[PDB]
Write a protein that binds this DNA or RNA. Structure first.
Ligand code: MN
Ligand code: MN
Lengths: 431, 434
RNA sequence: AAAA
């Protein structure tokens, strides 16, 4: 009988990886977790322990071992002496990656002593987050797990206690349905413009005049009356009106983008703004305005990454996708623009066409927190912005947080990366 | 004779500073075990933290630095210890093993337990509990609460976390007290009176419409008379926020507006002041610019700060050391951060981010920001409070939305909303100190 | 300071 002992902290991912790699070699699994004691400010990791048992399919081979106090050696040793299985194991393997420092020292030294009898082989190991290696005590076996252990997005979110997972594929992208028969032409025209280095020109026009016409009061594009009132206000600026700029200063590559939309979903009438039924207005403008206001950039980047990832053995749906959402039980949903899994490292990618320092900064804080919540503390966050290189470098330094590794866990791309964004993400993710 | 304290320098310097402050006076030597930098194994150095610890604990020549080449490798760790741990005769070796990787902990603990297993050398190990603020001993079985005994100031806290060029304002040096000299107290007391009268939600509604419709447009709208008068003529033709200002403004907001000096009033009597053609750009800016920026959000900063100041002094916190307004600092050659209010209870940093906004999306972004900031400057056990203008339901949603599990039952991200403004002083007091 |  051979037993593997895992220490259940609040990062289930390392225990999942070690367990996936070693489960075949063991007959019993002891998951050591914390009880909830509100009066010493101690939450339980039982919920993680259950998820580990569940996704590692341990079933009847799993023993759960609760510790009443994970900060007190005395009580830790007391609970171990009382509760640790007293069977005649021939090998006891403790992986001491998870948990508090005291849990580690005292579980380690408890087990080494309890099983000192040389009929029993004691082994300790540790999953190194920096170099993706399982290191054994005194053995220098040093096996890299970086490329060997895989996880899909459903398992990753599940062990971090997220549920109701939804995302989209290239074949299920929602705007492909909203723009029937025209999506490909639309996305081609946009991809052509970005590859021709017109992204900055595009975002400038989107900011002015596009957002000045089609973004104002809430439900502006849902009530024909409110929209015409907005049109007549802007016409008061005369030659300085956004409408005049729309009609007279729009570049040909933007007219071609606008004219790629289906006849009944175009913002223009000839080379002129369409000046207006509420449901007929919504059917004409709603999806088109929402797509042009930024969703297009989500699709563009996703289609640039897909190719590279297909060559790399990743499986769409399991290892990458677009428009990820999920929730903890009875809790609000998050939204992440693009996810990618390299081995067992989550890379969350957040996209904005903004060039403004303040807005991109806030999006940075957001993507850092989300990948931590859903993929754990060793996840990578990428922010793709419309900022110049100087601003992206500042933002990287501004939000950098130190965790002991030499590689950045928060990376910022900018307007000059848009044309070759697939290659830039390939380089950054697969290092 | 000689007694040595051993500390493991991870990337969270605060625990080590706290254990060191508590035990400094009882030890003759301090060994700071830190990591070396090696890009091949993706391993950064914690030397910068070790050096801040030596500095801010005033260790001087009693400090021995001990570098580890590889903090994931038991054999290299033991080798480095064998070669670099001081060889003098010690009567006591105390290892506090709170910091570092788990392999650092296990092998440093066991290396020292073995090396100093003599009958007359006292070996001790301790652990600082982040959850109940207890220094816990392995062999003596002591458990000593440090929550109220160990203190730290904002300058020391930010410095050990590698921040520098620290600035902030005092109650008596607050910036708007100069822009409304002779009138600040009257203005803020009128606002305070209304917010304490549960007019918060009404105030914010009015600020959104019509106040922000009239006074928030193009950049420098309120400093160019032509831009402002054009803007007003456009609004007048429309209904009009000018009509709503003149006809639908509640009495308590007239009382706030009328608390400003006459030359800083937005109103001309019981109507909106409209600049005449004789009004220069300077006249327009001098009348309106500071008043508008205050009413558009800055007032909230002063309001919340003023509601907690007496409570903090009553708890013997020292302004400037343990609390303050408009904190800014930076890492070397890096952009500055801005934090609306900071507070320090014992050694836990509380950062408070304020906004009058009631929109979910904006309040969520500010939530992410204060979470990250207090982590950067105060470490992993800091608390972030976000005070918004949202209703209770949106405030509760946002707390659960951004909640992150680190093993504690007390939340380290707290959100307050419009319903909390009238008693925000006691709300923060109960939240922070209980 | 519960994969530093
Ligand atoms: Mn986005
Ligand atoms: Mn604020």
């Amino acid at each position: 009988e051979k037993v593997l002992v895992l220490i259940v902290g609040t990062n289930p991912l390392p225990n999942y990886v070690v367990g996936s790699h070693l489960k075949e070699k063991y007959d019993k699994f002891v998951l050591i977790y914390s009880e909830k004691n509100d009066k010493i400010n101690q939450n339980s990791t039982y919920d993680y322990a259950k998820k580990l048992k569940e996704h590692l399919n341990l079933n009847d081979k799993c023993i759960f071992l609760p510790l009443s106090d994970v900060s007190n050696s005395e009580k830790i040793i007391n609970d171990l002496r009382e509760k640790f299985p007293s069977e005649d194991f021939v090998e006891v393997h403790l992986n001491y990656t998870g948990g508090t420092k005291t849990m580690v020292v005292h579980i380690y030294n408890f087990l080494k002593e309890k099983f000192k009898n040389n009929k029993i082989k004691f082994e300790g190991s540790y999953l190194d987050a920096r170099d993706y290696k399982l290191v054994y005590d005194y053995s220098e076996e040093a096996i890299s797990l970086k490329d060997t252990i895989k996880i899909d997005i459903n398992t990753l979110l599940s062990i971090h206690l997220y549920e109701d997972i939804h995302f989209e594929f290239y074949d299920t992208y929602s705007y492909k349905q909203k723009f029937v028969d025209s999506f490909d032409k639309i996305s081609q025209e946009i991809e052509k413009a970005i590859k021709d280095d017109k992204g900055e020109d595009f975002v400038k026009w989107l900011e002015d005049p596009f957002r000045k016409i089609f973004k104002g009061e809430n439900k502006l594009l849902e009530k024909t009356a409110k929209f015409k009132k907005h049109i007549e206000k802007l016409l008061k600026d005369n030659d300085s009106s956004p409408i005049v700029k729309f009609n007279e200063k729009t570049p040909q590559f933007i007219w071609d983008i606008l004219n790629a939309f289906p006849e009944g979903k175009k913002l223009n009438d000839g080379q002129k703004l369409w000046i207006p039924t509420n449901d007929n207005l919504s059917s004409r403008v709603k999806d088109t305005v929402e797509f042009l206001n930024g969703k297009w950039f989500e699709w563009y980047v996703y289609s640039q990454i897909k190719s590279e990832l297909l060559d790399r053995k990743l499986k769409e749906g399991e290892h990458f996708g677009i428009s990820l959402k999920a929730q903890k039980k009875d809790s609000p949903y998050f939204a992440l623009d693009i996810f990618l899994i390299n081995g067992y490292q989550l890379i969350g990618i957040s996209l904005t066409t903004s060039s403004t320092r303040e807005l991109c900064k806030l999006k940075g804080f957001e993507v850092i927190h989300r990948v931590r919540q859903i993929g754990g503390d060793e996840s990578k966050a990428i922010l793709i912005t419309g900022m110049d290189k100087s601003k992206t470098e500042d933002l990287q330094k501004d939000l950098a947080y130190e965790t002991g590794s030499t590689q950045k866990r928060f990376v910022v791309f900018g307007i000059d990366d848009w044309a070759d964004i697939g290659s830039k993400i390939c380089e950054e993710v697969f290092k």
